[PDB]
């Protein structure tokens, strides 16, 4: 499938994940949050969405994969909430955090995040 975003047709699988990945960005962010072809319950990003965003797309960057949600947890118990947990997760990102914010940060598919 196809994602245009400020004039480039970025290519995205069946499941809605970018495999453009070098063409993200957070105008790319903002579109894959909002693109309710692959989800019912369109997000708006707020600062704690951006800071989970930020670190799972660094952590891609770094290390080469997702990572898994353990790390995601780790993360935003010390910058989002010391309460954070998996229900926090899935308030802030719906489907989850493999079909939802590995997706909307960008990553070329879910592998790894579990």
């Known amino acids: 499938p196809e994602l245009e975003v400020k004039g480039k047709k970025?290519?995205?699988?069946?499941?809605?994940?970018?495999?453009?990945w070098e063409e993200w960005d957070e105008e790319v962010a903002e579109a894959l949050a909002k693109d309710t072809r692959f989800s019912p319950?369109?997000?708006?990003?707020?600062?704690?969405?951006?800071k989970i965003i930020r670190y799972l797309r660094d952590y891609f960057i770094k290390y080469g994969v997702a990572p898994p949600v353990r790390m995601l947890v780790k993360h935003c118990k010390k910058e989002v909430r010391p309460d954070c947990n998996l229900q926090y997760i899935y308030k802030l990102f719906p489907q989850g955090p493999a079909?939802?914010?590995?997706?909307?940060?960008?990553?070329?598919?879910?592998?790894?995040?579990?």
């Open 41 to 50: 319950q369109p997000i708006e990003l707020t600062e704690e969405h951006w």
């Open 10 to 20: 970025l290519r995205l699988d069946e499941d809605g994940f970018l495999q453009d």
């Open 99 to 114: 079909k939802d914010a590995c997706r909307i940060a960008g990553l070329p598919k879910p592998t790894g995040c579990v």
